[PDB]
Amino acid sequence: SPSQVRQNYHQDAEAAINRQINLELYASYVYLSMSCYFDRDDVALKNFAKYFLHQSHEEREHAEKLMKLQNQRGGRIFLQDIKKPDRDDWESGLNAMECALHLEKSVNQSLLELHKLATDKNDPHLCDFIETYYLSEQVKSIKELGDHVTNLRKMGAPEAGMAEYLFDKHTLGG
Amino acid sequence: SPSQVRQNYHQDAEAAINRQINLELYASYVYLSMSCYFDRDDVALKNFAKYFLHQSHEEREHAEKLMKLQNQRGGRIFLQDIKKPDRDDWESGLNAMECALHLEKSVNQSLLELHKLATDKNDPHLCDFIETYYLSEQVKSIKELGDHVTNLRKMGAPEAGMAEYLFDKHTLGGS
Amino acid sequence: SPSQVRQNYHQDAEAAINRQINLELYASYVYLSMSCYFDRDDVALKNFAKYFLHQSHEEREHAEKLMKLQNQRGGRIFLQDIKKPDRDDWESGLNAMECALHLEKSVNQSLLELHKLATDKNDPHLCDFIETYYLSEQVKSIKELGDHVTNLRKMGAPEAGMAEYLFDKHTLGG
Amino acid sequence: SQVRQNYHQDAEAAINRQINLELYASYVYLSMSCYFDRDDVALKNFAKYFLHQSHEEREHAEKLMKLQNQRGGRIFLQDIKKPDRDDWESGLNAMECALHLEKSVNQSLLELHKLATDKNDPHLCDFIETYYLSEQVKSIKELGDHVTNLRKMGAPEAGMAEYLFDKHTLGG
Amino acid sequence: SPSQVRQNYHQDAEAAINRQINLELYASYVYLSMSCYFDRDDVALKNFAKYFLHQSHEEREHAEKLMKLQNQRGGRIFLQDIKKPDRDDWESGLNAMECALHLEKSVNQSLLELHKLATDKNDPHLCDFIETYYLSEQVKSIKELGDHVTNLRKMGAPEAGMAEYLFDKHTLG
Amino acid sequence: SPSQVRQNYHQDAEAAINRQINLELYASYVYLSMSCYFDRDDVALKNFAKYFLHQSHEEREHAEKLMKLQNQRGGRIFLQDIKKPDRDDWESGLNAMECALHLEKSVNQSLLELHKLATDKNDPHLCDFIETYYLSEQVKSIKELGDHVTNLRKMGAPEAGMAEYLFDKHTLGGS
Ligand SMILES: [Tb+3]
Ligand SMILES: [Tb+3]
Ligand SMILES: [Tb+3]
Ligand SMILES: [Tb+3]
Ligand SMILES: [Tb+3]
Ligand SMILES: [Tb+3]
Ligand SMILES: [Tb+3]
Ligand SMILES: [Tb+3]
């Protein structure tokens, strides 16, 4: 039962988007876990929790956009189980940013492989969609997280207690 | 090594919230699957997709509110795998509302069992929290879905194709 | 063949709401009778009539809200005959407030027995519903009427005819 | 009473029965409004329509109570009887029963006017003419239109008939 | 003897509110003592003083609401002596928040026992009153103070004197 | 142990402020008891309760200002137990005003003795502080209460029931 709107859309590209959708929703669920960690009483960092809550909502937005793309090209969405985060306790603010940096680069690697697949199968619309909305956004996110990890390291976190506290107020803020 | 903020909060109630958090996140993920079904070209119902997209975000807000409650009472959040929906193809608008009605009642019963646990362990704050923010909302949601299923049945869906089309415009896209 | 929306809703609770609906409508009809008494030319207390007219409409709202609750929980509304008030002539302003005080406490008594019924059958939504919208209102209404009876008693009504006149303008005027 | 003038005791008693009939009409419309609010019916604007009519019938009853006091008459309330049926079946049937109700109320007002004319009470005649008789003919005509449309559209057998009538006519 | 407005209100519940009223007024007086400590020249922390001054007035407002509840249910208010705080000197910003955390939990414990008493005597209005206004506020207050103590502990107070200064400006200010 | 800001501030004056702080808080607690009495159902006087509630909060402001003064002069605040009112039942509106009149004069007497102690120890700032904020306000309060008592006595309270009722609306119910 091929779709009426389907044109120049390969089955491997269709399946690759379905895996990417799960990975975007996974990223959202990892960021949601990070947000709730800093909301705890024994951690108590409000702007850290707000930061990762916003990232979780943006990952959800990215996942919904892939679902939109899938329906536009005539592909069918087949959802899978969103796996839990690798750890519940995220230790500290620096560690969460370090894990977030690794997470975004892992998502970026998947998007590069997704674009690579689109390039091989001669799908220029899918290439443009990944280029415009995702590849530009990931490089910005990776750079942003890279800056936050660097500052937290220089300030002396997590050994220095005032480092993570002052980083919560100034950098992240409102 | 108990939490400094913890007081009159049993570990069974703490564990029950963790399961409820997962069930609320599950409900959101089911509604997200429903929303994307009507977005498809072979279904093409825009306000149906908008309806379940709004309901999906509400369930996420309900889930995040439980996570806030868990930290407020000194409990620790232990997340689990969010299971996928029972079906990808939701057949029709009537069936999705029927499955949504079945889903909300399953969520409502978990909250009733959660309230029953809170009553047995003498936790009045947890009882009020469930009463104020959830139980009132669930009865309203079950009633709303009950109204939509009834109208779609009377109108003649899904046999009458114009029924689900007109229901998309009038009920779900206006007042 | 139970209702599709019905869940954790016992038939005794359903029947008790139907009796409560009648009692709320009864209360509205009693206040309507009180309102019309002070509207008479041989009584001529305008704000007294306006006060009980407002209370009568609130009792109608309370009755309509129970009907909405009955439909929400999957219960079926079965209406009965609204009985007339115990008396047409309400004697005086003080006596009407005393009868209104007795009425509100009788309604409050029924709501406490209704909440008692709801607690026995493990119905937390029905408990919260009665707690939020009714029990808070009844205690406020009983206290409000308790104040009005006290003032009218001290001022010297209904023997002192100027007492009920001044009470109409100052207390019930605003 | 000091205010009473040219007001016969039969006319006073006839208003008391009319007050009960107006309060009865309000209670019937309230029952109809609750029927469409049910989950197995689920028609929102049908419920809002009869809820508005119910509050108007209450407002009509309060106006007769004021008239009674204006003319020096004493109000003697009676038991408001319950509606003949709880289950109103469908939207068409509720409008048909509502049409029958308004004509029954109108008939009582015509008999009330006849009594006022017989006892030479011009103020009572004008009061019924201005505020009620004009409104009743408007209400009967309005309900007559709604029943006709619902019959034409094919209610209650046609499922979308009562659904579309809920949105277009009664919604507005 | 009994009040005209009284209905389904036990004498033990009436007495329990009077003790709660005194406990709420006590809490206000403890926060007033804490507020004055940071206003001193040898401590000098303005937003710390403002914080506990605000908390003192909220406890005052909570006490007045119980008094209003007592009169609504037909109960008679019998006041007692408001005791002084256990200490005049509150050491530091961290210790004051720790003592404030201990205070709120002690008040919360009384309200939980008060609700349990109301549940035992079949008083649903008294249960709802405590659930709506007090239990929600106390849990929120305990969580808020729990966050402040944690931040002050990490930053290194009271050994690090700059920690409590920056906490005054950023968090409380 | 000493205060860097302390200058020309004797320890007897410091101790006198601490007793005055307790007396101001005592006055606030007495007015709070009066306010709650008229809020009762068997008394039922709203603007009477409202009047003494305003007075209760003003006495708290006066108490907090002494605490501020104490810290400005390098003095250390030592709090004591706030004693209960002499009676719970305040009988009537006239009696409460008479007890309030007696209370304010007792507070004024303490402030006069406090000022005389400040004059004796040559502390001009403490003299100015008591003159500006307290002594001027106390004379106005005593005069204000003196008017209310006299009006209630003439009108015929507490024997005349309408006396206290009409006084509640006109004089006290202006705000
Ligand atoms: Tb992404
Ligand atoms: Tb939910
Ligand atoms: Tb509750
Ligand atoms: Tb009511
Ligand atoms: Tb009519
Ligand atoms: Tb004419
Ligand atoms: Tb409190
Ligand atoms: Tb003073």
Curated annotation (Swiss-Prot), chains B, F:
Source superkingdom: Eukaryota
Major place of residence: cytoplasm
Alphabetical GO biological process terms: immune response; intracellular iron ion homeostasis; iron ion transport; negative regulation of cell population proliferation; negative regulation of ferroptosis
Q: Name one GO molecular function term.
A: iron ion binding
Summarize what gene deletion causes: Homozygous mutant embryos die in utero between 3.5 and 9.5 dpc. Heterozygous animals are healthy and fertile and do not present any apparent abnormalities. They show slightly elevated tissue light chain ferritin content and 7- to 10-fold more light chain ferritin in the serum than normal mice, but their serum iron remains unchanged.
Q: Which InterPro entries match?
A: Ferritin (IPR001519), Ferritin-like (IPR012347), Ferritin-like_diiron (IPR009040), Ferritin-like_SF (IPR009078), Ferritin_CS (IPR014034), Ferritin_DPS_dom (IPR008331)
Cellular component GO terms held in the UniProt record: autolysosome; autophagosome; cytosol; endocytic vesicle lumen; extracellular region; membrane; mitochondrion
Provide the coiled-coil residue spans. none
Keywords on record: Acetylation, Cytoplasm, Cytoplasmic vesicle, Iron, Iron storage, Lysosome, Metal-binding, Oxidoreductase
Residue ranges of domain Ferritin-like diiron in the record: 7-156
* Compartments, record wording: Cytoplasm; Cytoplasmic vesicle, Autophagosome; Autolysosome
Tell me the residue numbers annotated for binding Fe cation 2: E59, E104, Q138
Family per record: Belongs to the ferritin family.
Q: What is this protein called?
A: Ferritin heavy chain
UniProt source species: Mus musculus
Lineage, highest ranks first: Eukaryota, Metazoa, Chordata, Craniata, Vertebrata
